[PDB]
A paper describes a structure:
We identified two virulence pili independently critical to A. baumannii catheter-associated urinary tract infections, the chaperone-usher pathway pili Abp1 and Abp2. Further, their respective tip-adhesive proteins, the adhesins Abp1D and Abp2D, make use of large, distally oriented binding pockets to adhere to glycoproteins like fibrinogen, a wound-healing protein important in CAUTI pathogenesis. These proteins share a common binding mechanism, using a large, distally oriented, and flexible pocket that recognizes a complex glycan receptor.
The C-terminal helix results from the six histidine tag added to this construct for purification. The carboxylic acid residues of the citrate are coordinated by the side chains of the amino acids R86, Y100, R102, and Y141. Y100 and R102 sit on the left-hand ridge of the binding site, while the base is composed of the Y141 side chain, which emanates from a β sheet on the opposite side of the receptor-binding domain core (β strand 13) and R86, situated on β strand 8. The R102 and Y141A mutations reduced binding relative to Abp2DRBD WT by approximately ~70% and ~90%, respectively. The crystal structure of Abp2DRBD shows that K34 forms a salt bridge with E87. Therefore, the K34A salt bridge seen in the Abp2D structure is holding the anterior loop down, keeping the pocket open.
Author numbering: 1 to 173
Write the structure that this text describes.
Amino acid sequence: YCTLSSGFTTVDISMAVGRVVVRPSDPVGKILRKATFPINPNGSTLRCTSYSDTITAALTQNYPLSPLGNSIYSTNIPGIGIRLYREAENATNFSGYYPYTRSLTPGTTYNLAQGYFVVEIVKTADQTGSGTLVPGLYSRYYVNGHMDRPFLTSTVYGNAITIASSSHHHHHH
């Protein structure tokens, strides 16, 4: 089982990007935007007693996997997928895509590493929509017994991620 430092505090990442244009000429699979957000740890730590204790990088939107698989999940916008993970500086220490669960090592004091939370916005179908990604919690990174106090969450606030399909612009030739 795992114990948390006194005053353990989740770090929340505000997922936000400038308006993402997606065009008919973009291929399915296009990384329309990879956006990074600094993870600034706050000193929270935890320590566990068993190799059966785990950390989980979980997705929370409960949207179906997109037709592209590879951890690209559908969103509320047609033809637009979202994929989440973490990195350190210079794209090192790739976490692997959310979701995953791994066992921890007993006795090790864990802290959140300085680095980056990553949002990828992906074209998942030929026909793409426009509009505002649905707000709310998108991920939590937590140890067993403490899903209610994650190390790290990521959340969309309000209209922070918008998609513009250029076909919808009705360009006057």
